Write a protein that binds this ligand. Structure first.
Ligand code: FES
Ligand code: FES
Ligand code: FES
Ligand code: FES
Ligand code: FES
Ligand code: FES
Ligand SMILES: [Fe+2]
Ligand SMILES: [Fe+2]
Ligand SMILES: [Fe+2]
Lengths: 104, 389, 388, 389, 107, 104
């Protein structure tokens, strides 16, 4: 039900971490302040990897065309994106980040 | 958005209208006649700058944007409707459903993550009185009646007409059509003599400003328009003079026509009764792009049955179409075109020197600015742009 | 106002000239020949970007802007001259007097408050030497002589010519005409051989800069121009060489011509004597719009009576027109068209690499910049603008 | 430089590429075939927006910019080559040496101080495999091998081809050619049937995206390119389905071609083997201006002797040219043209919706962005600009 | 007659405009610039707009139709596209009562 | 070899003086502050006289097209100039301006 990402310490606030899953699409984990969030890694507008993008607050900007999404809700924040990003559950138990292998 | 801000700031009374160079979004527009679109034969057209495709499936009309989501090519370059309910792009085979525009298959890669997750823009399509109306807008459409003139949809009202592309912004066509004094350009129309019409050369206004028109914004159906009442208090001009000498006379025929004229959003004129005391003329000026429009002409005559419908149709072809729609309205076409240069740089909207009868045009500009359902922009054409904050 | 300010800032020696893409306002310009405009027969033309209407009433010429004050349509789309002294717009019947442009009547509404309170732009028109000149300017016009080259208006000078629309900005036409070294493009002209002309290939300049030209700004009639004096100290070139070897020679004819060349505002060239030792050649490059101009060509030859005038006319039609105006000047037309691309983006005014004989062109650019009577702008065309 | 800064800011993965509307400066480009230019017969052409003149003197090719230094006219309007080693401008006779472009004489003024003090731009020209290549760049040119695909310059490789001007930006041509899924547009090609080729409708990707392509950042001669490896772990699609129903089938031929496809800077595609198991196809998309390119097609086949070269030439003219270069690639031309509108306003570079097989195009865009030798700008065409002091 | 009773000076705040309708005649516009009053034709000379529906900025009235403007004291154009001067009508205050001339001044 | 041009005080700061040389191309002597420099007078881009141009620091702007050169190195400072100017070292001795006979 959950996958071990990394130690909450390994991520500086404002950074992104790509999570490759065997036999499944990649996920992206973002650290906004002291809170962690996760969404599918692939931009809904194409084939770009959001973890290669730029994070500003709780909004992730895609490196391909500048589209953006709110990492908390997965809702588009900037054009050309229109399709909501899949959001996954995240838990920080014992100074360690865990991501729900299933999207909420 | 479409015009230099310095100009919009100057036309304080109707800036939205001046800015609506591409037309008003979120309104129904006639683009062709029902008999022009056959079952399983997709037809292309451009409306408000957008390339669209219309198809008839099981007798019902469907409209998809004619631009593949992938690399932006027009699907119509090489139409590939491989199943009754879909159309496949000729390039990489992305397949869309006519019904909801959903990307349901991709022949070049049936495992693609895009399948079922993308949707091609669709627009509502409705047929009425043998005319094809497209709702160039977003969200569920309002009733068609809202964007049609009174009586056009009357059960007994038989509609006939023609359509063509004219080279001028739609607004120039509208203002010319609603222009009370432009009747002057029709003084030599064959319809005048050949149909023995009474037709003045112009009008000497009477009464106050408010009495020159009747602005309608309390129509239960939602219709928004303006009535030209210049003739209620004016004095029709039948003897044109220069230096006190009569140099021109109006038409002294018996048939009284066009005493009831009104313009309605999104841009359709109703001339009643015309071209004959027992008929009505409904004409749309539909935006294709900033420089062109569809001049959708329709004539209506109440018909109780096939008997009259056939007779009417016969007279339409032999008389009304050639003598009125063309013999009368053709002068309207080059009149509109004649205004292109003055307004092409948007400066005409500031430098025009109006006179009394233009009060009707002003009322329209203000009504349009206040009651339109949206300003179409180039971004709507290429793809909406934004950065939520 | 017409060119990128960054470019204008770069050409400090003649910025007004570079900005005058539409020509100079407030000058007289020839636009057609008298015989081309007949009584009660309105003619349309575009000058300095403005659409105009010209008409002849009781023999006199009148000029009105071809644009109704009402909805800005050209009256010419459908001319309606209801009375001899007026014209009525085909749209809503606003009627204007040819004599003063006053909106004197409106057939569609005889009670309109606009009647007698508006005035369509009019421009002075004058006929001289069979040529129709329009003063594209504001206020009382100066004497026509100010904008014509010397001798064009002489009593006995019989003027004959040809006019046409050429696709190049007017300035390219002017510079080519006053260009001392462009004589090279005429080396094979049929006129050279057929009229036994002496014609060098170019000139090796002599003396200092000031000696290459004579700037005229002391003329009593007020005309402003420049004389090309490259031949007063130079050395004509008759043997063209490459690597010191003769590859081409000039013409060794007996007739001496074109040793008196001058350019005058607003843009008219005088070549004397040409195309024959007893004739003069006066040509205008009139701005129509940013991309085109009228190439108004005229040949003048003194004639004492009607008999000599007829003789000249016949020689003009059979020889001078085809041999000179066309046989010689046709090369000037494509030469000026060849410079269009380089100057079209206005970058040629910066990137051009000039050589000695261009001193004449520079002199002209400076004269024009300093003595022109106004820069025509796009606002003059659409309607002057100004905010309180 | 050539595109709205707001757009370039959005495409962070390949801004230089999107900016390269006029092409990449400092690369070799083929523009014509050797047999097209004879001794002493100057020929004109436009490359990367620059007008050029090419001449053959004593068998060797020379290239000068077709624009006089004086008043900017094209020398070619009226060519005057008065001595074997020079060209004289028809306007004021400024004379240039073909060898170095130096202004060696001015017939209209032999005493001019400009003589020997100005130089007309010259560009290196090299003939290889019967093709004329021009180095549209500055300074000493790199080996031609750097800008050509592997094996094109092989000693035994016999090259034959065709060249023409196509109306589309060069990049649309490159991307279509390297597009793994565009194979769909060739499903009905006469070559597939007449040469019994096996041709799938597309591919279902397999493996990681990193395995989809192979980028060559450097090789013996500095080549820069990308190989399309979609078929390495991908599943060829031979049955096209919609809603599960088969509506189209790929071609089940026995000849296997195009197992090796690569794109190389400055923009040349190599398809091996094609159109037959024993041949290779090398095609360039040369930038002429922002709206057009030369579609320089070539087919190569190893030939050991004159006998084989002749046989090949016969097979080329009778079969390969009309069946492949034309019968197959003509569809590439109109597909190319169909993408013009979407990218004409530069907005397609932002609004395109890519899918899996586009990893190949993305790889090319990044490679092009990272390794091109310069962005051609309009200022290069009119004259480089710089201001300070 | 010669003088038309408009209103009480106190009924007008500085910087305001009041339209004066006249039977069988074109309407006038009275402007109050500070404590002084001025008047001109109400109809903009550039069209059919009512200047009393415009914006008064100091002694300059801006037409609501196209942005043209006039100086209320002289009637001369202040902003394009206006080019025809407004007819000006003298105004006087007798016993705190505002009166505007029935005929325009001539110049 | 050296040519006696003028007294340093004959030139106000920031001015340019043209020096004619019979049977040779004219030179331009520039006074930048209290320093003196010299180059060929003719702009290498045309026929303009740099002595009739605008001096800004040690850079002379050509009056014709705005091209410019550094008067110390002779190297182009602004387009459209591309051909380097010929420079002539100068020496001020006893309040007298001397300019090298030949380019260097
Ligand atoms: S692929 Fe992410 S914005 Fe386009
Ligand atoms: S452009 Fe339509 S499927 Fe690729
Ligand atoms: S446009 Fe001329 S009268 Fe209306
Ligand atoms: S433009 Fe070529 S020599 Fe003058
Ligand atoms: S009506 Fe007043 S400025 Fe036009
Ligand atoms: S002549 Fe000096 S910059 Fe052109
Ligand atoms: Fe009409
Ligand atoms: Fe000439
Ligand atoms: Fe292909």
């Amino acid at each position: 039900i959950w996958l071990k990402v990394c130690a909450a310490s390994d991520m500086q606030p404002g950074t992104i971490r790509r999570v490759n899953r065997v036999g499944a699409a990649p996920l992206a984990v973002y650290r906004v302040g002291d809170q962690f969030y996760a969404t599918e890694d692939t931009c809904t507008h194409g084939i770009a990897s959001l973890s290669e993008g730029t994070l500003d607050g709780d909004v992730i900007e895609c490196p391909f065309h500048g589209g953006a999404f709110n990492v908390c809700t997965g809702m588009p924040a900037s054009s050309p994106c229109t399709v909501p990003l899949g959001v996954f559950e995240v838990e920080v138990k014992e100074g360690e980040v865990y991501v729900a292998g299933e999207k909420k | 958005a479409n015009v230099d801000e310095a100009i919009l700031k100057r036309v304080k009374g109707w800036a939205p209208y001046v800015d609506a160079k591409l037309g008003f979004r979120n309104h129904w527009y006639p683009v062709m006649f029902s008999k022009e679109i056959n079952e399983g034969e997709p037809k292309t057209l451009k409306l408000l700058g957008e390339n669209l495709l219309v198809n008839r499936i099981d007798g019902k009309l469907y409209c998809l944007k004619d631009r593949c989501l992938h690399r932006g090519v027009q699907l119509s370059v090489k139409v590939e409707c491989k199943t009754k309910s879909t159309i496949t792009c000729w390039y990489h085979a992305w397949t869309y459903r006519w019904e909801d525009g959903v990307l349901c298959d991709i022949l070049t890669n049936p495992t693609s993550a895009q399948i079922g997750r993308q949707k091609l823009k669709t627009y509502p399509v409705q047929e009425a009185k043998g005319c094809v109306f497209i709702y160039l807008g977003d969200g569920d459409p309002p009733p068609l009646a809202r964007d049609t003139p009174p009586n056009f949809l009357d059960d007994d009202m038989e509609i006939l007409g023609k359509n063509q592309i004219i080279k001028s912004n739609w607004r120039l066509a509208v203002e010319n059509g609603f222009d009370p004094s432009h009747i002057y350009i029709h003084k030599d129309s064959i319809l005048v003599k050949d149909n023995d019409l009474a037709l003045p050369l112009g009008f000497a206004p009477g009464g106050d400003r408010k009495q020159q028109t009747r602005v309608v914004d309390d129509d239960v159906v939602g219709r928004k328009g303006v009535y030209d009442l210049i003739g209620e208090h004016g004095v029709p001009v039948f003897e044109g003079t220069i230096g006190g000498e009569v140099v021109r006379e109006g038409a002294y025929g018996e048939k009284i026509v066009a005493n009831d004229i009104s313009i309605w959003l999104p841009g359709v004129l109703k001339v009643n009764p015309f071209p004959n005391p027992d008929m009505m003329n409904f004409e749309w000026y539909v935006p294709i792009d900033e420089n062109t429009h569809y001049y959708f002409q329709t004539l209506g005559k109440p018909c109780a049955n096939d008997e009259e419908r056939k007779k009417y149709e016969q007279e339409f072809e032999s008389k009304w179409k050639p003598m009125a729609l063309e013999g009368f309205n053709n002068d309207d076409i080059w009149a509109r075109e004649a205004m292109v240069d003055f307004y092409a740089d948007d400066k005409g909207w500031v430098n025009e020197i109006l006179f009394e009868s233009d009060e009707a045009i002003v009322a329209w500009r203000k009504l349009a600015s206040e009651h339109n359902q949206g300003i179409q922009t180039q971004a709507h054409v290429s793809g909406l742009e934004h950065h939520h904050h």
